[PDB]
């Protein structure tokens, strides 16, 4: 992200590659020129000009050393995104344990983290990361697991961005929805009052999908996944009492491809 989003260590990487190459090549060239000087103890003017270029470049690169604290500051500025990604990868790896068919590989996460920007800067890139990982991983989870993952992404965002009272409100609303904690939630807009009225009126899925649509605003069906895809291999799964061939028939009819 520091070589691609801000290009920070992009130009710092080309600069440090040039600096290390300068170190090695100029040490070798200084050894060769000192050997020539020992052999010599037109040519004099060239040697003096090369020496002057060498000391000017070395002086400039030594004065460039003071930018390294700025580089380290800019590197450690983007670390909250790292902790968030560690949380996201841990949640991917642990949803590989509730079921035997929801595994995760590191390469897929690397691919999606490149594709988030292949196509409040920290807040914007964090929002992009959450949105893209949800978009790319909603298609491998069924309705229950997809809804759970969406709720976890929304709660993680609203707890690592917003304050503590909203966090406590979300926790107690979840606890009331789980029929575990018998405590009236504290509201901070009309949406929370509407949710309280709905759970008073024994309506759940309406307000749950209301919160889900409040978090994410873009949907991704199987056609969208197969359209914006890189690999040529796709695996489809379902449950036994549900077929899925007719959807592929409709997709092939729409996309004008010979399905066999």
């Amino acid at each position: 992200t520091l070589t691609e989003e801000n290009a920070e260590m992009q130009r710092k990487r080309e600069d440090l590659i040039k600096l290390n190459t300068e170190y090695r090549l100029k040490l070798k060239n200084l050894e060769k020129r000192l050997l020539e000087e020992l052999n010599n103890s037109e040519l004099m003017v060239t040697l003096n000009n090369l020496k002057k270029e060498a000391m000017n470049i070395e002086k400039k690169l030594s004065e460039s050393e003071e930018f390294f604290p700025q580089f380290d500051n800019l590197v450690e500025e983007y670390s909250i995104i790292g902790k968030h990604s560690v949380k996201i990868f841990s949640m991917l790896e642990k949803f590989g344990q509730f079921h035997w068919f929801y595994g995760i590989s590191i390469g897929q996460f690397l691919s999606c983290f490149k594709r988030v920007f292949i196509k409040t800067r920290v807040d914007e890139i964090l929002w992009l990361l959450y949105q893209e990982v949800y978009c790319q991983f909603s298609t491998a989870l069924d309705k229950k697991f997809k809804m759970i993952m969406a709720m976890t992404m929304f709660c993680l965002y609203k707890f690592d961005i917003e304050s503590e009272q909203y966090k406590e409100a979300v926790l107690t609303m979840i606890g009331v929805l789980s029929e575990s904690s018998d405590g009236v939630p504290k509201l901070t807009n009309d949406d929370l009052r509407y949710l309280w009225d709905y759970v008073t009126t024994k309506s759940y899925i309406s307000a749950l999908n209301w919160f889900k649509n409040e978090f994410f605003v873009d949907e991704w069906n199987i056609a969208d996944v197969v359209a914006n895809s890189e690999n040529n291999y796709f695996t489809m799964a379902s449950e036994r009492d549900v077929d899925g061939t007719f959807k592929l028939i409709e997709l092939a009819k729409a996309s004008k491809e010979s399905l066999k």
């Binding site: 000087e37 003096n48 002057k52 000391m55």
Partner: peptide
């Protein structure tokens, strides 16, 4: 024209101490 070479040799003999310290 030898002043630059003399200064380079002097600088090498100067930072020899830091070379020893950041060698050990």
């Amino acid at each position: 024209s030898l002043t630059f070479e003399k200064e380079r040799w002097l600088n090498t003999t100067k930072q020899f101490s830091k070379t020893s310290q950041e060698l050990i």
